[PDB]
């Protein structure tokens with residue numbers, strides 16, 4: 001049956017080239033299979049590439065974007081001039097080279113490097129991986145990426161037009177559990193968005209719900225809110241979506257189970273990877289993707305804060321019982 005040149009067994013001969021780009025990305029792009037800044041920039045890139053898709057622009061007779069087509073790399077010259085795409089040139093060039101050198105399409109390569117990067121971060125699910133997305137693209141239309149200063153209505157309408165329900169917007173946001181900011185407030189470069197930027201866990205949902213108490217840098221940056229402890233950055237859209245009645249109950253159900261969070265996240269990501277494509281025309285090469293190491297820590301309210309410090313915003317469901325840590329307040333180191 002299909003055994004690839006390297007002795008691995010796969011479902012289809014179309015999957016064999018991906019064991020070679022797996023080796024290149026792990027050794028080089030990810031610097032020895034690490035979960036550091038290259039994984040976080042690729043998670044920004046996969047979203048910014050796939051969300052350039054708008055059925056409403058198509059309906060009005062305009063080109064609406066090809067979705068998860070790799071247009072952010074093939075047309076980086078126009079797309080990296082967009083407001084939301086700063087701080088990405090170096091990662092896009094590293095990916096362009098792996099793509100040209102292995103003979104794989106840019107849209108497939110971004111989806112693949114996202115599943116491989118996430119496998120380097122403890123706690124992550126195994127993301128689905130499909131191959132066969134066409135390599136040709138047209139530049140994404142501008143203004144299709146949600147920004148941190150937008151209202152929840154603006155974010156839900158843009159996301160809804162691409163096809164996601166309010167629940168799936170919250171599910172997709174689990175990627176901010178592996179995150180920092182570099183361009184919102186340059187003064188606290190790489191300040192984490194949750195206290196474990198290297199563990200794909202529930203802490204992002206717990207901590208954006210805590211009362212904003214601390215200014216982490218000299219001044220406040222673009223779309224920055226007060227955060228719960230030194231070193232942690234809180235962006236306005238995350239604070240608002242955690243508290244809005246349209247998204248608050250789903251945000252609260254994501255706080256106590258890393259297992260439920262990862263299932264939901266895997267499902268929204270599989271939907272986001274085929275925006276602009278018919279998944280039945282693609283080949284499944286999910287077995288090429290390795291397992292991540294498991295996360296054995298339980299969810300916690302960090303540093304002595306309790307349930308009285310979180311601003312419960314889901315009026316129907318009571319806040320789940322999460323553990324407390326007998327701590328002094330943490331000060332987070334920049335994400336690596």
Ligand code: HEM
Pocket residue numbers: 037039040041043044047087146147148155172173175176178179180181182183184235237335
């Ligand atoms: C409501 C939509 C979203 C908004 C408004 C938003 C906004 C942002 C902003 C402004 C940054 C900081 C970038 C910087 O200055 O360095 C950021 C970082 C990040 N976002 Fe989001 N985001 C959203 C959705 C997502 C989605 C769905 C993903 C991917 C599945 C994602 C993954 C990330 C990651 C991993 C980072 C960290 C980048 C790094 O540490 O270098 N975001 N996001």
Ligand SMILES: *[C@@H]1O[C@H](CO)[C@@H](O[C@@H]2O[C@H](CO)[C@@H](O)[C@H](O)[C@H]2NC(C)=O)[C@H](O)[C@H]1NC(C)=O
Pocket residue numbers: 073074075096099100103104105106135136
């Ligand atoms: C996918 O399309 C892009 C063009 O949009 C190709 O990228 C170019 O590849 C050539 C030769 O391989 C390089 O010298 C160019 O610099 C690349 N241009 C850009 C903008 O990256 C790419 O080769 C195509 N890949 C496949 C498999 O067809």
Ligand SMILES: [Ca+2]
Pocket residue numbers: 048049050052066067068069070071072140
């Ligand atoms: Ca695109």
Ligand SMILES: [Ca+2]
Pocket residue numbers: 176177178194195196197198199200201202203204
């Ligand atoms: Ca985390």
